Amino acid sequence: LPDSVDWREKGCVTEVKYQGSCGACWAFSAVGALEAQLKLKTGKLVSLSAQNLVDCSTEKYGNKGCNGGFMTTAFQYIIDNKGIDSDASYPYKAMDQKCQYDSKYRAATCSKYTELPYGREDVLKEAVANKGPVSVGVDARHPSFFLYRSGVYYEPSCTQNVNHGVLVVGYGDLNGKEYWLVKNSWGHNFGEEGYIRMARNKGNHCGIASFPSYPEI
Numbered sequence: 001l002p003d004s005v006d007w008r009e010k011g012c013v014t015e016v017k018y019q020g021s022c023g024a025c026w027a028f029s030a031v032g033a034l035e036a037q038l039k040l041k042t043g044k045l046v047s048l049s050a051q052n053l054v055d056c057s058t059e060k061y062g063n064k065g066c067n068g069g070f071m072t073t074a075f076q077y078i079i080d081n082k083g084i085d086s087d088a089s090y091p092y093k094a095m096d097q098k099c100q101y102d103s104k105y106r107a108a109t110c111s112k113y114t115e116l117p118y119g120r121e122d123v124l125k126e127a128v129a130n131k132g133p134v135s136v137g138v139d140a141r142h143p144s145f146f147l148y149r150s151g152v153y154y155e156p157s158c159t160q161n162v163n164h165g166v167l168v169v170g171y172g173d174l175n176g177k178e179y180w181l182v183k184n185s186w187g188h189n190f191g192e193e194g195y196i197r198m199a200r201n202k203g204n205h206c207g208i209a210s211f212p213s214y215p216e217i
C-alpha cells in the first residue's frame with residue numbers, strides 16, 4: 001500500500017461544508033464518500049445534497065435529520081431511492097424540511113455499501129488506498145477537538161464511543177506521527193481549512209476505525 005494518500009490530490013474531494021446548528025454530520029459524511037466515487041466513475045466532481053438526506057432518509061432509516069443519523073442507512077436510502085440530488089439543486093438549510101427529492105435533479109446513484117471490520121486500522125488504510133474516502137465516526141466531544149489547529153491530533157481522554165460523522169480522505173506521516181486525514185463539516189474555520197489530522201495506529205484513537213463504511217456506484 002502507498003505510504004501516504006490524499007484524495008484531494010486526485011480531485012475527488014469537494015469543498016468543506018458548514019453544517020451550522022443542524023446535526024447533519026452523518027449526511028455530510030455520506031455525500032462526501034459518494035462524491036469521490038462519483039468523480040472516480042464519471043470524471044466529474046459534484047457536491048451532493050446533504051439536505052436531501054436530512055429531509056428524506058428519515059424514520060424508515062433510523063435517522064433523525066438535524067438530530068442525528070447514520071452514514072450506512074443514508075447510503076441504503078440512496079440505493080432504495082435510486083438516486084440523490086445535487087447540492088446545487090437541493091441546498092442545505094440546516095433545518096429539517098419536507099422531503100423534496102426530484103429525480104430530475106439526480107446527480108448520483110449508489111448500488112451498495114460496505115462496512116469495514118471494527119477497529120482494524122490496517123483494513124481502513126487499505127480501503128482508503130484502494131477504494132477511496134471512507135465515512136467514519138469519531139469521538140469528537142472533547143474540548144481539544146474544537147480547538148484543533150495543526151499537527152496530529154492526539155487526545156488522551158478520547159474514547160471509542162463515537163458521536164461525530166466525518167470523512168477520511170487520506171493518511172500519512174507528519175514529523176514521525178502517523179495520521180488519518182479527516183474532512184469535517186464545520187466549515188473552513190475549523191482546524192486546517194476544515195480538516196483534522198487524527199492519530200493513526202494509536203490503538204484506534206477516538207474510535208476512528210470503529211465504524212467505517214464506503215459506498216460504490
Ligand SMILES: C[C@@](C#N)(COCc1ccccc1)NC(=O)[C@H](CC1CCCCC1)NC(=O)N1CCOCC1
Nearest residue numbers: 023024025026064067068069137140162163164165211
Ligand atoms: C449529530 C451529530 C452530527 N452532526 C453530532 O453529534 C453531536 C456532536 C456535537 C459536537 C461535536 C461532535 C458531535 N452526530 C450524528 O449525527 C451521529 C453520527 C453517527 C455516525 C456513525 C457512528 C455513530 C455516530 N448519529 C447520531 O447522533 N444519531 C444516530 C441516529 O439517531 C439519532 C442519533
